[PDB]
Each structure stands twice: as C-alpha cells, then as structure tokens.
Amino acid sequence: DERAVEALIKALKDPDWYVRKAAAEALGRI
Amino acid sequence: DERAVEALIKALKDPDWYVRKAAAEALGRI
Amino acid sequence: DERAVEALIKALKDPDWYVRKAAAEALGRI
Amino acid sequence: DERAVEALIKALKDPDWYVRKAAAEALGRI
Amino acid sequence: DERAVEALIKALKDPDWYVRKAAAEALGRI
Amino acid sequence: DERAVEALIKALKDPDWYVRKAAAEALGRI
Amino acid sequence: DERAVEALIKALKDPDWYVRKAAAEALGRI
Amino acid sequence: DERAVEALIKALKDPDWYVRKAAAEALGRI
Amino acid sequence: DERAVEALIKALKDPDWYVRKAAAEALGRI
Amino acid sequence: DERAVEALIKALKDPDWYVRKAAAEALGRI
Amino acid sequence: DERAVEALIKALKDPDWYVRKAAAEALGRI
Amino acid sequence: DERAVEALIKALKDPDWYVRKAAAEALGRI
Amino acid sequence: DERAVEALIKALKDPDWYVRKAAAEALGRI
Amino acid sequence: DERAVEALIKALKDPDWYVRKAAAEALGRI
Amino acid sequence: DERAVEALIKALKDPDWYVRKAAAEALGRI
Amino acid sequence: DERAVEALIKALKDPDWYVRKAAAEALGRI
Amino acid sequence: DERAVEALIKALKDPDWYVRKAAAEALGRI
Amino acid sequence: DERAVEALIKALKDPDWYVRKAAAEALGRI
Amino acid sequence: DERAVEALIKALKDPDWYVRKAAAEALGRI
Amino acid sequence: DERAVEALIKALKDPDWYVRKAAAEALGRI
Amino acid sequence: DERAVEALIKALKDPDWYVRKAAAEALGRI
Amino acid sequence: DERAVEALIKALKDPDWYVRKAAAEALGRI
Amino acid sequence: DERAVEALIKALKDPDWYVRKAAAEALGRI
Amino acid sequence: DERAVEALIKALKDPDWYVRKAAAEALGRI
Amino acid sequence: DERAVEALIKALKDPDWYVRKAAAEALGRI
Amino acid sequence: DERAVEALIKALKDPDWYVRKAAAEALGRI
Amino acid sequence: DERAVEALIKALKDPDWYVRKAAAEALGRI
Amino acid sequence: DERAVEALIKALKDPDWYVRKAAAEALGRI
Amino acid sequence: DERAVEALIKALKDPDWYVRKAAAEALGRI
Amino acid sequence: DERAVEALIKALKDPDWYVRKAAAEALGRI
Amino acid sequence: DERAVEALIKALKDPDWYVRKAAAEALGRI
Amino acid sequence: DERAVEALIKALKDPDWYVRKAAAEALGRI
Amino acid sequence: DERAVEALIKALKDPDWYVRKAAAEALGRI
Amino acid sequence: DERAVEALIKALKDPDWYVRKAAAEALGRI
Amino acid sequence: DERAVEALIKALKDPDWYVRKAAAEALGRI
Amino acid sequence: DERAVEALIKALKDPDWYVRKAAAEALGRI
Amino acid sequence: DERAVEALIKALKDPDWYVRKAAAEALGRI
Amino acid sequence: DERAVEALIKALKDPDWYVRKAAAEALGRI
Amino acid sequence: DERAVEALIKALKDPDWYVRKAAAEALGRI
Amino acid sequence: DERAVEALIKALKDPDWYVRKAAAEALGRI
Amino acid sequence: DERAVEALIKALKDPDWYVRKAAAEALGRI
Amino acid sequence: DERAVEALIKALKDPDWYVRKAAAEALGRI
Amino acid sequence: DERAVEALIKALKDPDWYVRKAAAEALGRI
Amino acid sequence: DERAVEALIKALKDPDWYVRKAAAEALGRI
Amino acid sequence: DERAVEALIKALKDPDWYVRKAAAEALGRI
Amino acid sequence: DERAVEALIKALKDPDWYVRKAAAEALGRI
Amino acid sequence: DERAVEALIKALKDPDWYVRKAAAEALGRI
Amino acid sequence: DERAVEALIKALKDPDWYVRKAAAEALGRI
Amino acid sequence: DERAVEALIKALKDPDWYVRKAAAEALGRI
Amino acid sequence: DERAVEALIKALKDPDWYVRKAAAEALGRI
Amino acid sequence: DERAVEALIKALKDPDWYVRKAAAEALGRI
Amino acid sequence: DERAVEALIKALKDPDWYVRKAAAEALGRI
C-alpha cells in the first residue's frame, strides 16, 4: 500500500543512485 | 493516507532539507 | 492530516532551500 | 494491486539500486 | 479545514508579506 | 472560515506586495 | 457566506476603486 | 446577499475603473 | 431573486443602453 | 420575474445597441 | 410562464421577422 | 402554451428568414 | 400534447417534404 | 398520439427527402 | 403502444428491408 | 407486444440487411 | 415474458451459433 | 424462465463462438 | 493479471537484452 | 484480457529474449 | 478477439519477415 | 469487429507472409 | 460494413495495382 | 454510411483496379 | 448526403478530367 | 448541409466537367 | 447561409474573372 | 453571421466582378 | 460587429485607394 | 471589442482614405 | 484597455511622426 | 495589464511624439 | 511586475543612452 | 519572476545607464 | 534559481572582464 | 537544475573572472 | 546528471588544456 | 543517459586531458 | 545502446588510428 | 536500431582499426 | 532493414574496391 | 522500402564489386 | 514504385551505356 | 506519380539504351 | 499532368531535334 | 497548372519540333 | 493568369521577332 | 498580379512585336 | 502598385528615349 | 511603398523623358 | 522614410549637379 | 534609421549641391 511512500522516503537515500530522483519523481506523482 | 501524511510531515522534519522539499512536494500532490 | 499545511508554513522557512518553494508549490495545490 | 506494491517495495529493497530506481518509478505511476 | 484557514489568516498576518502572498494564494485554492 | 475573504480585503493592501495580487487571485477563485 | 457578501459590498464601497473591481470580481465568483 | 447585484449596478459606474467591467464580469456570472 | 430581476428590468430601462445590454446579459444568466 | 422576457422583447429594439444581441443571447438562454 | 409564451407567439407575429426568429429561438429554450 | 408549436409551424415559413431555422431549432428542442 | 402530435402528423402530410422532415424530427423529440 | 409512429412509417418513404432519415431519427428516439 | 408494435412488426414484414431495419430499430427503443 | 422479439428473431435473417443488426441492436435493448 | 425466454433458449439451440450469441445477449438483458 | 441460465451454462461451450462470451455477459447480468 | 509486474521484475534481468529496458518501459507505464 | 497477459508472461518466458522484450513492451501497453 | 495477441506471438517468428516487426508494432499498440 | 479479427488471424495464417505482416499491422491498429 | 476489411484482404491481391497498397493503407487505418 | 461502404466494396469490385485502389483508400478513411 | 460518394465513384470516370482525380482527392478525404 | 451536397452532386452532373472536378473537390472538403 | 455555395456555383461562371477561381478557392474551403 | 453572408451573396451579385471575387474569397473564409 | 464586412464592401470602392485592397485583405481574413 | 469595430467602421468613414485603408486592415486582423 | 485602439486612431495623426506608422503597425497587430 | 495600457495611452499623450511612436509600438505588441 | 513598462517609459529618456533604444526594444517585445 | 523584475527596475535605476540599457533589454526578454 | 539574475547584476561589474558582457549576454537571454 | 544554478552562481563567485564569464554565459543558456 | 556542470567548473582548470575551452563550449551549451 | 554522463564525468577525470576536453565537449552536446 | 559511448571512450585509444578522432567526432555528435 | 549499435560496437572491436574508425563515425551519426 | 549496416561491415572488406569507401560513406550517413 | 534494402543487400552480394559499391552508396542515402 | 530501384539494378548492366552510370546516379539519389 | 515511375521503368525497358539512361536519370530525380 | 513524362518519352525521339535533349533535360528535372 | 501541362503536351505535339523542344524544356521547369 | 503560357505558345510565332525567343526564355522560366 | 498578367498578354497582343518580346520576357520573370 | 507595369507598357513608347529600354529593363525585372 | 510607386508612375508621366527612364529603372528595382 | 524617393525626384533637378546622377544612382538602387 | 533619412533629405536640401549629391548617394545605399 502507500507505505511505499515511506519506502520512497528511504529511497530518498541517493540521487546519484537516482532512487531518490525516482523517489522524488514518485513523489512528483505522490 | 493520513499516516503517510504524518510520515511526510516527519519528512518535513527530515534533517536533509532536500527531503523536506520532496516531502512538501509530495504533500503538494496530496 | 492537513496539519501538513501548518508544516508547510514551517516549510516556508527557506526558498533557497526550496522547501518554501516546494511548500508554496504545495500551497500551489493547497 | 497492493501485493504488487509490496513486491515493488521489495524491489525498493532490491540490492541492485538500479531496480530500486525502477521500482520507485513504477510506484510513481502507482 | 477551517483551523487551517484560521492559520492561513494568521499567515495573512505573518510579518513576512511574502507569506501573506502565499497564504492568500493558498486561500485562493480554498 | 470565509472570514478569510475579509482577510483578503485587508490583503488587498498592496499589489507590489502581490498580497493584493494574491488576494485578487484568491478572489479570482472566491 | 452572506456576511462575506456584505463585506464584499462594502468592498464595492471601498474608496480604492481597485478594491471595488476585485470585490465585484469576487462577487462574480459568488 | 444578491443585493450585491444592485451593488454591481452601482459598480457599473465605470469601465475605465473596470468596476463596471468587473461588474459586467460578475453579471457575466450573475 | 425576483426583485433582482425587477431591478434588472429597470436596468433594461437604464438610459445608458450599455446597461440594458449588461442587464439583458445578466437576465440571460438568469 | 419572467416578465423580463417581455422586457427582452423590448430589448430586441437594437443589435447595434446589442441590447437586442444581449436579448437574443438572453433568449439564447431563455 | 404561459403568458410569456403567448407574448413570444406575438413575437412570432412581430413584423420584424428578426424578432420572430428570436422568439422561435426563445420558444426553443422553452 | 404549446400552441407555440403550431406557431413554430407558421414560423416554418422561411429559412432565409431563419424563422423556420429558429423554428426547426425550436423543434430541435420541441 | 396530443393535438400538437396530430398537427405534426398533418405536418407529415405537409406538401413541403421539408416540413415532413422537420415534423418527423419534432416527433422524434416527442 | 403514437399513431405518429405509423406516420413515421409513411415518412419512411424517402431518405433523400430525409423524411425517412428524420423518421429513422424519430424512430431513433421511438 | 401495442398496436404500434403490431404495425412495427408489419414494418418488419415490410418488403423494403430498409423498413424492417428501421422497424427493428424502433422496436429496440421499445 | 413482445412477440416483436420473435419478429426480431426472424429479423435476424440478415446483417447485410442490417435487419439482423438492427434486431441485434433491438436485442441490444431487449 | 417467459415464452420469449423459451424461444430465446431455442435461439440458444439455433444452428447458427451467431444466433445463440445474440440469444444469450438478449437473455443477458433479461 | 431462468432455466435460460442453465442454457447459458451450455452456451458456455465456446468463447470463440462468443456464445460463452455472450453467456458470460448474460451471467455478467445474471 | 498484474503478476506480469513481478514477471517484469524478472524481466529486469538484462538491459542489454532490453527485456529490462522493455520492463522498465512497461514499468514506465506500470 | 487476462489469459492474454498470462500468454504474455509466457512470452516473458519465451527462450528468445527478443520475445520477452516484445512481451514486456506489450505488457507496457497493458 | 485478443487471441490475436497470441497470434502476434506466433507472428514473432520472423523480423526479416517483419511479421515479428509488424507484431512488435502491433504489440507496440497492444 | 471480432470476426474481422478472426479473419485477420487467418491473415496471420496467410501463406504470403507479406499478408501476415499487413494482418499484424492491422491488428496493431486494433 | 467492416466486411470491407475482408474486401481489403482481397484487395491485397496486388501492390503494383496498389490496391494492396491502398488496402495496406486502409489497414494502415483499420 | 454502410450502403456507401457496400458501394465502395463494389468499387473494390470495379473492373478498373484504379477504382479499387481509390475505393480501398476511401475505406481507409472509413 | 454521402451518396455523393457513389457520385464520386461516377466521378472516377476520368483523371484527365481530374474529376476522378478530384474524386480520388475527395476519397482522399472520404 | 445536405441540400448543398445534393447541389454539389448536381455539380457532379454539371456538363462542364471542370465543375464536376470542383464539385468533387468541394465534396472532398465535406 | 450556405446558399452561398450555390452562389459560388454561379460564381463558377469565370476563372478569368477569378470569381470561379475565388469560388473554387471558397470551395477549396467549402 | 448570416446576414453578412447574404450581403456577401449580394457582393457575389455586385456588378464589379472584382467584388464577386472578393466576396467569394470572403465566403471561402466563412 | 461583422457589419464591418458590409463596410468592407463599401471599402471595396477603390484599390488605388487600397481601401478595397485593404478590404480584400480584410476579406482575405474574413 | 465591438465598439472598437464601430469606431473602425467610422475609421472606414474617415475622410482620409488612408485611414479607411488602415481601418480595413485593422478589421482584417479582427 | 482596447480604447488604446481609439488612441491609435489619434496616433494616426502623423506618419512622419511615425506615430501613425507605429499606430498602423499596432493596427498591423490589432 | 490594463493600467499598463492606460499608461501607454498616456505615453500616446506624451509630448515627445517619439514616445507616442514607442507607445503605439508597445500597444502593437499588446 | 509590468510596472517595468512604466519604467521603460522613464527609460525612454535617452537613445544615445540606448536605454530608450533598449526600452523601445523592450517595447518591441512589450 | 517578479522580484527579479523589481530588481531589473532597480537596474533601470542603476547609476550606470549602461546597466539600465541591459536591464531594459532583459525586461524586453521578459 | 533566478537569483542568478541578481548575480548577473553583480556580474555587470566589468565588460573588460566580459563578465558583464557575458552577463549582458545572459540578460540577452534573460 | 537549481543547485547547478547555485553552483554557477558560485562560479560567478569564482576568483578566476574567466570562470564568472563562463558561468554567466552558462546562466545565459539557462 | 547535471553535476557534470560542476565537473565542467573543474574542467575550467585550463584553456591551454582546452578542457576549460571545451567546458566553456559545454557551458556555451549549458 | 545519466550513467553515460557519469562515465563522461569520469572521462573528465581521465588522466589524458585530451579526453577531458572531448568529454566536456560531449557533455556540451548533452 | 549508448554503451557505444563507453565504447567510444575505448575508441579514444588512438587519433593516429583516428578511432579516437572518429570517437571525438562521434562525441562531436554525442 | 540497437542491435545495429551492438554490431557497431563489435565494429569498434573489429581488428581492422580502420573499421573501428568507420564504426565510431557511424555511431557519431547515431 | 538496418541489417544493411552489418552488410556495410562486410562491405568494409575493401577500399580499393571502395565498397568499404562506399560503406564508410554509407556509415558517413549511418 | 525494406525489400529494396534487402535487394540492396543482395546488391552488396553482387559478384561485381562495382555494384556493391553502388549498393552501399544507395544504402548511404537510405 | 521503388521497384524502379531493382530496375536500376538491371540498369547497372552497362556504364558505357551509362545506364549503369545513370543508375549509379539514380542510386546517387536513391 | 507511380504510373509515371512504371512508365519510366518501361523507359528502362526502352530498346534505345539512350532512353534507359534518361529514364534512370529521371528516376534519380524521383 | 505527369503524363507529360510519357510525352517526354515520345519526345525522346530525337536529340538532333533536341526534343530528346530537352526531354532529357526535362527528365534532368523529372 | 495542369491544363497548361496539357497544352504543353500539345506543344510536344506541335509540328514545329522547335516548339516540342521548348515545350519539353518548359515541362522540365514543371 | 498562366494562360500567358498559351500566349507564349502564340508568342512562339517568331524568333527573328525574338518573341518566340522571349517566349522560349519565358518558358525557360515557365 | 493577375490583371498585370492580362495586360502583359495584351502586351503580347501589342502591334509592336518589340513589346510582345518585352511582354514575354516580363512573363518570364513571372 | 503593379499598374506601374501598364505604365511600363506606355513607357515602351521609345527606346531612343530608352524609356522603353528602361521599361524593358524593368520588365527585365518584372 | 505603393505611393512611391504612384509617384514613380507620375515620374513616368514626367515631361522630361529622362525622368521616365529613371522612373522605369526605379520601378525595375521594385 | 521613402519620401526620400520623392526627394530624389527633386534631386533629379540637375545631372551637371550630379544630384540627379546621384539620384538616378539612388534610383539605381531604389 | 528614419531620422537619418530625414536628415539626409535635409542634406538633399543642403545649399551645397555637392552635399545633395552625397546625400542622394547615401540614400542610394539606403
């Protein structure tokens, strides 16, 4: 479920992983 | 989801103001 | 919940943090 | 689908941070 | 939310007229 | 509540503050 | 809200005809 | 209340004040 | 509101045929 | 009331006054 | 309103066939 | 009343008067 | 109205098949 | 009355009269 | 109306299968 | 009456007559 | 109608499985 | 009667006949 | 069903197979 | 269609990873 | 029906037949 | 149309793989 | 109707007639 | 229009394969 | 109406009349 | 407009095949 | 109205008047 | 505007065929 | 309003005034 | 703006035909 | 507002002031 | 902006006709 | 904001400062 | 950005008229 | 962010540094 | 990217005014 | 990502390496 | 591609400053 | 894919092979 | 095409460094 | 298709055949 | 055209290496 | 159509016919 | 034009190889 | 039309008529 | 113009082969 | 119009009038 | 200009064949 | 305007005035 | 400029045929 | 402006002043 | 520049006809 968001928060680890960037993108949807 | 909002508020309390920015943005979607 | 808004008000701290900017964006939704 | 989200969260736990990026992106769609 | 409006009115009382602008804008959304 | 409108009227102070402008925008919604 | 309308009518009585314009516009929304 | 309309009629004073224009706009809603 | 209509009919009797136009338009909305 | 319609009929005087045009518009609603 | 219809029928008897057109159109709305 | 319809039938006189056209429009409602 | 239908049937008997078309169309509405 | 339908059947004479077409339209309602 | 249906069935017996099509369509409405 | 349905079954003769198609449409209602 | 259903069941026994499809569809409506 | 359902079960023979598909549609009503 | 997603996760094997790339594309939809 | 998805998952199991790519792409559309 | 997809999978035989290519194109829609 | 799809699948069975290509392409549109 | 498609399949006879080409174009729409 | 399609199919049967090309093209539009 | 198409088919007489060409152009729209 | 089409078809019957060309072209627009 | 088209047909008099040419241009729009 | 068209048709009746050309051109725009 | 067009028709007086030319230009827009 | 058009028509009545040219040109834009 | 146009008309005073020229340019936009 | 236009009109009233030229030009942009 | 325009008007001081020239350029955008 | 405009206006107040030129130019872009 | 502009204003220090020149260039974009 | 702008502003603070020039230029692109 | 820019800033080391020059070129794009 | 950028940044770290030049240039394209 | 770039980096081996030169050229595109 | 790129990378692995040069050049185009 | 490229790679056999040269030329396009 | 490419590849297989040169050149165009 | 290319291949017969040369020229376009 | 190409191919079959040369050349243009 | 080409083929009769030469020239365009 | 081409083809039929040469040349331009 | 061409054909009368020569020149443009 | 062409055609009818030469030449330019 | 051409035709009076010659020169442009 | 042309035409009416020559020449430029 | 031309016409006073000659030169540009 | 032209016209009014010559020459450049 939307706990994915809190997983996005952990995905906000690294925007040279772009897992943040993808998370910020996902937060750019969510 | 409300807890997700609460986590996003904690993401607005996240020492990395980068996160706070992303958190606010996510709360913009919400 | 929408107490996030008041967290956005605190996020209005800094638009060279863009946490304001993201907050203003979030207020640009809310 | 929620289990799919759960798997995508596990994809956010995927040792290949490439996957985490894709997973976050997928969760962006969702 | 009404208290949120009340806070936004206090944001229209916020010494930083920048905030008042953002507050009015937020109240525009609302 | 909608007393915000009357706060918008006070926000009509200054459109080089754009707090008027934002108020007129808010009145452009309200 | 009706008192808000009454205030907006007083905003149509506001010496700054700029306000009257904004007030009429707001009453257009309403 | 809708006595605002009759205030719009008085706001029809001046469309280089645009208080008429805003009134005609408001009548363009009302 | 009916009196408002009556006033708008008087606005259709308004020596400024500009007003009559606006009045008819307003009655179009109504 | 809808006697406004018969006032629109008198407003059909002049479509270079556009009071007809506005009347025809109002009849374009009514 | 029925008398209004009767007047609109008289507007369909109006020597200006322009009016008859507008009258028919109004009766289209009705 | 709906005798207007039979007046529309007489209004079907002329679609370069468009009183027919408006009648056909009115019959396009009726 | 039924007599109106009867007239519209007579409009389906109207030597101008243009009318019959309009009559059928009107009966389509009805 | 609905004998109009049987008049539509006779109106099905000609769809280059479109009295059929209008009849088929009327049967497209009826 | 049932006789109308009976006529429409006869319209399904109408040598012009065009009519039968229209008749079936009309019976679709019914 | 609904014996029309069984007439639709006979109308299911031909969908290059579209009397079937219209019948299937009528069965698409019935 | 029940006999109509019985006929539609016979239409589900109709050698043309096209009909059976239409019959089932008709029974879907019913 | 609803024995049609059991005929739908036999109509579940073939969804490249779509007699199943139509049956599933009919069961999508029933 | 959406278990395809988890098949996309296995398709994330290889983006010189582009089965990942196509999976990331599919996750770029999903 | 879900079986189609299941086949596409089998196409993600297709020894030709070319197919898997196309399959993933198709599942992207879906 | 969408079994065409599985026919596209068989059409994925040959992209120097371009029947794969056309299939991949079709999967580029589907 | 589904039979058309079935024919297009037979066109994917058409000995001329040129046709299969065109058939797949057509199914791409569909 | 869409049996035209199967006529396009026969039109796939000859792309030095370009009746295939036009058919492939038509299938490039259909 | 369907008869128009039927004629266009006959135009695909037109001895001048030039016409068939144009017919297919027209059916491409349709 | 679209019987014009069949008139275009007759207009396909002659593309040194360009009445075909114009017809093919018209079929290049239709 | 349909009569306009009918006239354009008569323009496709116009002894000057120049007109027929223009008529077909006009019907191309339509 | 579009009777202008039939006036264009009369304007097709002369393309050294270019009233045809302008008509063909107008038909190049219409 | 239709009267404008009527005037433009009269401009197609204007003794100066120069005007007719311009009129046709204007009707091309319309 | 578009009575300007009829003023353009009077402006078609003189294309060594270029008031025609400008009118033809204006008709080259209108 | 319509009054602006009316003024531009008066500019088409402006004794300086230079103005009329400019006025027509302006009405070309409009 | 567009009363600027009427100011352009006064600006049409002088094209050795080029205030006309600039006005004609402005009318070359307006 | 309208006040800006009003100022530009005052710039068309600016004793330096150089300004009027620039003002008209600016109003050309607007 | 666009008060910059009125600052451009003051910048119209001097085109051997080219602050006018740049202003006229800016008005050449604005 | 508006503050940026305000700064650019201050750049139009910049003692170096060189800057004012650049500022006006920048405001030209904006 | 666009505070860069105000940094360009400080970069307007020196056009024998060309940091002004580059700033004026940047203002030649901004 | 905004941090990139911030770095470019720091590049406008770069002791080598060569860099400041390049930085301003880069900000010109941005 | 655009951190490349900050790498360009380090590449601004040396324009007899032309790594600055290439960086300035890259900033001449960025 | 971002990893490609990362590699190009490593190419800006490439001991051969020749490469750094080429890398910066490539990043100029990007 | 763009891993070609990293192959270009290896192609940066030798510009008396000109495989660097061609790589720098390719980077002169990429 | 990506496989083509892969082959071109293998052409960058081609023992003839002449080919590698051509391959890099081809990848420059791509 | 682009397998031609790999045929160009085989065409890179011989630049005293110039089939390489033509291939390098073709790669000078591709 | 792809078959044309295939033929051109066969022209790259043409025993006359002259042809291969021309074929490669043609594929250069393509 | 482009089968002309394969006719060019046959035209590659003879460059003392220059039908090859013209073909190579044509391939120098194609 | 394609038939023109077909004729030009026949011109490549023209016993005068002079023509074939010209034909190939013409196909070069095409 | 382009049948002129086939007339050029007949014009290829004679290049001491230069009607071939002019044809080859025309084919040197076509 | 096509008739002009037709005349030029007749000029290719002009007994004076001088004309045919000029005609072909003219068709070269066209 | 281009009937001038046919006048050029008559101008092909005489190239010791050079009216042919000028015509051939004009055809050397046309 | 077309009338100019018409005059130039009359100049091709000018008894002085000198003029015809000049006229043809002028039409060459046109 | 281009009536100058017809003035050139009158200027074709005399090429020992060279007003013809200058006219022929002007026609050598026109 | 057109008036300039008109003056140049008057210069073609200038009693000094020297001027007419110069005027024609000037019109040659134009 | 181009009124200079008419000043050139007055400059055509004297070609032993060469102010004509210079004017004719200027007309040799204009 | 236009004022420059105006000055050059005054230079065509310069008592020294030498200047007028130079002025005309300068206007020749312009």
Q: Say if AH2 is an interface residue toward chain AI (CB within 8 Å).
A: no
Distance CA AA5, CA Z1 (A): 10
- Are F22 and F3 a contacting pair, CB within 8 Å? no
Closest-CA residue in chain AG for F16? AG1
Per the CB < 8 A criterion, the answer to whether AQ1 and AR5 are in contact is: yes
CA distance AE26 to U27: 54
**How far is the alpha carbon of X8 from chain Y, nearest alpha carbon, in Å?**
8
Q: How far apart, in Å, do the first and last CA atoms of chain M sit?
A: 9
Give the pair of three-digit tokens for residue AK11: 């590449």
Task: Please compute, for residue L13, the number of CA atoms within 13 A of its CA located in the half-sphere on the CB side.
Answer: 11
> Whole-angstrom Cα distance, residue AH29 to residue AI30?
6
Residue located via tokens 């015509």? AU23
The angle at the Cα of AU11, spanning AU9 to AU16, to the nearest 5 degrees, equals: 130
d(CA H15, CA H8): 12
Q: CB-based contacts of T21: which residues, under 8 Å, 6+ apart?
A: S17, S18, S19, S21, S22
Say which DSSP state AX8 is in. Answer: H
Q: How far apart are CA AC27 and CA AB8, in angstroms?
A: 10
Tokens of AX2: 């057109």
Beta carbons of AC8 and AC30 less than 8 angstroms apart: yes
Q: What torsion, rounded to 10 degrees, do the Cα atoms AT23, AT24, AT28, AU1 define?
A: 20
CB contact set of AY8 (below 8 Å; sequence gap of 6+): AY23, AY26, AY27, AY30, AZ12, AZ24, AZ27
| DSSP annotation string for Z1-30 | -HHHHHHHHHHHT-SSHHHHHHHHHHHHH-
Asked whether C23 and C8 are in contact (CB, 8 A), the reply is yes
List, in order, residues 6 or more apart from AE29 with CB less than 8 Å away.
AD29, AF28, AF29
Could you say which of G1, G7, G29 has the minimum Cβ distance to residue F9? G7
* Total number of domains in chain N: 1
Taking only Cα atoms into account, the Rg of chain AG, rounded to an integer number of angstroms, comes to: 8
C-alpha W21/C-alpha F20 separation (Å) is 64
Query: Which chain W residue's Cα is nearest to P17?
Result: W1
Q: What does the alpha-carbon distance between residue AG6 and residue AF10 come to, in Å, rounded to a whole number?
A: 10
Chain AE residues in contact with AY1 by the CB 8 A cut-off are: 15-16, 18, 21
Contact AT21, AS17 (CB under 8 A): yes
Phi and psi, residue N27, nearest 5°: -70, -25
The reply to whether A16 touches chain AK by the CB within 8 Å rule is yes
Report chain D residues whose CB lies below 8 A from the CB of S18: none
Question: Closest Cα partner for X2 from V23, Y11, Q18, P15?
Answer: P15
Distance CA AG1, CA AH8 (A): 10
Give me the residue label for tokens 């220059």.
AQ18
CA distances from AN23 to Z29, AB19, AN27, AO20, AO21 (A): 50, 66, 6, 12, 13
Query: Residues W18-25: contacts with CB within 8 Å, 24+ apart?
Result: W18/X21, W18/AQ1, W18/AR2, W19/X12, W19/X17, W19/X20, W19/X21, W19/X24, W21/X21, W21/AQ1, W22/X20, W22/X21, W22/X22, W22/X23, W22/X24, W22/X25, W22/X28, W23/V22, W23/X24, W24/V22, W24/V25, W25/X24, W25/X25, W25/X28
Distance CA E25, CA F22 (A): 5
Q: How far apart are CA Y22 and CA Z17, in angstroms?
A: 11
Question: Reduced to 3 states, what is the DSSP secondary structure of residue I21?
Answer: helix
Which of AB2, K30, G25 shows the shortest CA–CA distance to J8? K30
Contact AA25, AB27 (CB under 8 A): no
H13, burial (CB in 10 Å: exposed 0-12, middle 13-18, buried 19+): middle
Q: Are J10 and K12 in contact (CB under 8 A)?
A: no
Pick from P13, P16, P12, AL19: which is nearest to P25 by CA? P12
Number of H helices, E strands in chain AO: 2, 0
Those residues with Cβ within 8 angstroms of residue AP3's Cβ, 6 or more apart along the chain or in another chain: none
Tell me the CB-side half-sphere exposure of residue Z26, using CA atoms within 13 A.
33
AJ16: helix, strand or coil: coil
> How many other C-beta atoms lie within 10 A of the C-beta of residue W21?
20
Give the distance from residue AY3's alpha carbon to the nearest chain AE alpha carbon, in angstroms.
9
Task: Pull the structure tokens for residue AY15.
Answer: 């070609």
Considering only CB atoms, Y12 lies closest to which of X1, X22, X30, namely X22
* Closest-CA distance of chain Y to residue X16, Å: 10
The answer to whether P9 faces chain O, any CB pair under 8 Å, is no
Q: Which amino acid is at AQ12?
A: L
Give the domain range for residue AF26.
1-30
Residue appearing with tokens 């009003």 = AF6
Local structure of residue AL1 (DSSP, 8 states): -
- Residue AZ6 tokens read as 């105006």
The torsion angle over the Cα atoms of residues AV20, AV23, AV27 and AV30, rounded to 10 degrees, is 180
Chain AG residues near residue F19 by CB distance under 8 angstroms: none
Q: Which residues of H touch I11 (CB under 8 A)?
A: 9
Chain L hits for M25, Cβ within 8 Å: 24, 27-28
Residue numbers in H near AE3 (CB within 8 A): 16
Q: Which two tokens mark L29?
A: 């409602």
- Supply φ then ψ for residue A18, to 5 degrees: 60, 15
Alpha-helix runs per DSSP H in AH1-30: 2-12, 17-29
**In contact, AD14 and AD24? CB cutoff 8 Å:** no
Select from AA1, AA14, AA26 the Cβ nearest to the Cβ of AB28: AA26
- Judged by a CB distance cut-off of 8 A, whether residue Q26 touches chain P is yes
The DSSP secondary-structure symbol of Y1 reads -
Technique used to solve these coordinates: cryo-EM
Alpha helices in O1-30 (DSSP H): 2-12, 17-29
Closest to N26 measured CA to CA, from AM1, Z26, O8: O8
Question: What sign does the CA torsion over S21, S22, S25, S27 have?
Answer: negative
Cβ burial, residue AK7 (10 Å; 0-12/13-18/19+): buried
**DSSP 8-state code for residue AD14:** -
**Resolution of this entry in Å?**
6.0
Rounded to the nearest angstrom, the gap between the alpha carbon of residue Q4 and the centroid of all alpha carbons in its chain is: 9
Structure-block tokens of residue J28: 């374009």
DSSP Q15: S
Please state the length of chain AL.
30
- CA C13 and chain centroid, separation: 8
How does DSSP classify residue M9?
A: H
Q: At what angle do helices C3-11 and B17-29 cross, to 10 degrees?
A: 140
**Hey, are the CB atoms on O20 and P19 less than 8 Å from each other?**
yes
SS3 (DSSP) at AB9: helix
Enter the tokens of residue A7: 């997983």
- T18, U18 Cβ separation under 8 angstroms: no
Nearest Cα residue in chain U from T2: U2
Burial code (b: 16+ CB inside 10 Å, e: under 16) for AC1-20 equals ebbbbbbbbebbbebebbbb
**From CA O6, how far away is CA H2, in angstroms rounded?**
57
Q: What are the tokens at M24?
A: 């059928």
* Packing angle of the helix pair AC19-27, AB17-29 (nearest 10 deg): 30
CA angle C5-AG1-H29, nearest 5°?
65
Residues of chain AQ in contact with residue AP18, where contact means CB-CB under 8 angstroms, are: 12
Q: T1: how many CB neighbours lie within 10 A of its CB?
A: 13
| Diameter of chain AL measured on Cα atoms | 23
Say what angle helices AM19-27 and AM3-11 make with each other, to 10 degrees. 140
Contact Y9, X7 (CB under 8 A): yes
- What gap in Å lies between CA G28 and CA H4, rounded to an integer? 10
Annotate AI3-25 with DSSP letters as a single string.
HHHHHHHHHTT-TTTTHHHHHHH
Distance between CA atoms of AD21 and AQ13, rounded to whole angstroms? 67
Q: What angle do CA AP28, AQ4, AQ9 make, to 5 degrees?
A: 65
Q: Which amino acid is at P24?
A: A
| Residue type present at position AA13 | K
Considering only alpha carbons, which residue of chain AH is nearest residue AI12? AH19
Nearest in space to AX21 (alpha carbons), one of AW26, AZ28, AZ12? AW26
Is the torsion defined by CA of AD21, AD24, AD25, AD26 positive or negative? positive
Residue S17 at interface with chain AM, using a CB cutoff of 8 Å: no
* CB distance AD21 to AC22 below 8 Å: yes
CB N9 within 8 A of CB O13: no
* CA separation for the pair W28, X6 (Å, rounded): 20
By C-alpha distance, the chain W residue nearest P15 is W1
Taking contacts as CB-CB distances below 8 angstroms, the residues of chain AY near AX18 are 12
Interchain CB contact of N9 with M (< 8 Å): no
Tokens standing for residue S26? 């599919």
Degrees (nearest 5) of the Cα angle AS6, AS9, AS11?
115
Q: Quick check: O12 and P10 in contact, CB under 8 A? A: yes
**Angle subtended at Cα AX17 by Cα AX12 and Cα AX18, rounded to the nearest 5 degrees:** 105
Q: Which residues contact G15 (CB under 8 A, 6 or more apart)?
A: none
Tell me whether residues AV18 and AW9 touch, CB distance under 8 A.
no
User: Which of AH1, AH7, AH30 is facing AI9, going by the closest CB pair?
Assistant: AH7
Residue pair AD29/AE19 in contact by the 8 Å Cβ criterion: no
Residues of X in contact with Y1 (CB under 8 A): 1
